[PDB]
Design a protein around this ligand. Structure first.
Ligand code: THP
Ligand code: CO
Length: 136
């Protein structure tokens, strides 16, 4: 099945991208199955709820005692060299926490890297029926 491995926070970049020390190497990790509003790129840019999604991920990983990464069963990095994982901060999955708050939408679902897709879609449906943030 999937397994969690330890990692150490270096820096949170924005809502869905964080830099971590993993097995002794610095890497940027991109959260599987979600897309947060942009803070960066001019062909996207500071989007509504981008500042709040970044701050939520930053708060969540900086205050954690333990960060764990869980790779899915397909490729572990994307075309930019970013690690593709589910990230956990004291056992809470950051990717699901964002979707549950309406600060991310379920996106980039590429098989076989989709083990938690239904769990995330269930949380996104709840954030939409509660009209949270993106969905308000
Ligand atoms: C989440 C994810 C993104 N990506 C790619 C798709 C997009 O490519 P392009 O940049 O060509 O559009 C980009 C989205 O990342 P960001 O949302 O960080 O921009 O990263 C993957 O290749 N695999 C993944 O699992
Ligand atoms: Co994004």
């Amino acid at each position: 099945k999937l397994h969690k491995e330890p990692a150490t926070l270096i820096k949170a970049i924005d809502g869905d991208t964080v830099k971590l020390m993993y097995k002794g190497q610095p890497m940027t990790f991109r959260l599987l199955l979600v897309d947060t509003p942009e803070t960066k790129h001019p062909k996207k840019g500071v989007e509504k709820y981008g500042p709040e999604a970044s701050a939520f991920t930053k708060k969540m990983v900086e205050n954690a005692k333990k960060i764990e990464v869980e790779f899915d069963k397909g490729q572990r990095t994307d075309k930019y060299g970013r690690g593709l994982a589910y990230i956990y901060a004291d056992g809470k999955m950051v990717n699901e926490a964002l979707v549950r708050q309406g600060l991310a939408k379920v996106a980039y679902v590429y098989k076989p890297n989709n083990t938690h897709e239904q769990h995330l879609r269930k949380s996104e449906a709840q954030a939409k029926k509660e009209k949270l943030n993106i969905w308000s």
